[PDB]
Design a binder for this molecule. Structure first.
Ligand SMILES: Nc1ncnc2c1ncn2[C@@H]1O[C@H](CSCC[C@H](N)C(=O)O)[C@@H](O)[C@H]1O
Ligand SMILES: N[C@@H]1[C@@H]2CC[C@H]1c1cccc(C(F)(F)F)c12
Length: 259
């Protein structure tokens, strides 16, 4: 897998998944609004809080932290690929050619319903993200020996990482076990992923994915020592079915480590 991800094209990935039609946030019934809604509602309970937060396998995207950022002053983003960390860098620093997340920022504010403008939202995220670190979920210490990341983190977020980097269910489990070591007992995990997906494209790259189900995902969380607080499923409409992948649905999990 690590070899496959070496042809991964960030801009082709952003294009396939975060631009229209999937990047069209105008329809409430799309996968974008659904993801933002899950994240916004969860943080809106006020039960997920702290000082440090780590986003696992960020890739070139930031949407997964728009709702999160107002609850954690220290945010660490991560990814296996230098090209992704670079892409993240262009947006954090407002550099030339950065990807435009404004629609997602706008929708987050919309959905959070606190009358916040999207510039203040993006400003808070940029400010609270302290670092972008290399990571490998396959290592027992996914970050490494001495990472500048405050550990253990008060909360974890990861979207479309585990299943996308694991050849099978048992790898998925280990990878979960690994990243779980980074989470303080009682802390929270917000996990988003693909359901029953085997592949997706990212330019010239063809990534293999392990097809998992809601039940497999739940059972895996329990095994890692989590209490499943919430687990929802989004079924992928035909209109969002292109040739870029074969995802059947998307899951959202809010798990609390029972340490
Ligand atoms: N061994 C590994 N450990 C952690 N991340 C890995 C990894 N191997 C590949 N990845 C990364 O996993 C990411 C999956 S794509 C997910 C991007 C983003 N989180 C989203 O919500 O869209 C890729 O960026 C890929 O580089
Ligand atoms: N592997 C996942 C799939 C396919 C590319 C990655 C991604 C990013 C955002 C939404 C979705 C999808 F298809 F689940 F909606 C995906």
């Amino acid at each position: 897998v690590a070899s496959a991800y070496q042809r991964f094209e960030p801009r082709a990935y952003l294009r396939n998944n975060y631009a229209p039609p999937r990047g069209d946030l105008c329809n409430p019934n799309g996968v974008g609004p659904w993801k933002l809604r899950c994240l916004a509602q969860t943080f809106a309970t006020g039960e997920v809080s702290g000082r440090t937060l780590i986003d696992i396998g960020s890739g070139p995207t930031v949407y997964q932290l728009l709702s999160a950022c107002s609850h954690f002053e220290d945010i660490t983003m991560t990814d296996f690929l230098e090209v992704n960390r670079q892409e993240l860098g262009r947006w954090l620093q407002e550099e030339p050619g950065a990807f435009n997340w404004s629609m997602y920022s706008q929708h987050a504010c919309l959905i959070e319903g606190k009358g916040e403008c999207w510039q203040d939202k993006e400003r808070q995220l940029r400010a609270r993200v302290k670092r972008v670190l290399p990571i490998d979920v396959h290592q027992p210490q996914p970050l490494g020996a001495g990472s500048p990341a405050p550990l253990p983190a008060d909360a974890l977020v990861s979207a479309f990482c585990l299943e996308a980097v694991s050849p099978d269910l048992a790898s998925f489990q280990r990878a979960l076990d690994h990243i779980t070591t980074l989470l303080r007992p009682g802390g929270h995990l917000l996990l988003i992923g693909a359901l029953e997906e085997s592949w997706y494209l990212a330019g010239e790259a063809r990534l293999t994915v392990v097809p998992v189900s809601e039940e497999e995902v739940r059972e895996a969380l329990v095994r890692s020592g989590y209490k499943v607080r919430d687990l929802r499923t989004y079924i992928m409409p035909a209109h969002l079915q292109t040739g870029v992948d074969d995802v059947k649905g998307v899951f959202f999990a809010w798990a609390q480590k029972v340490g």
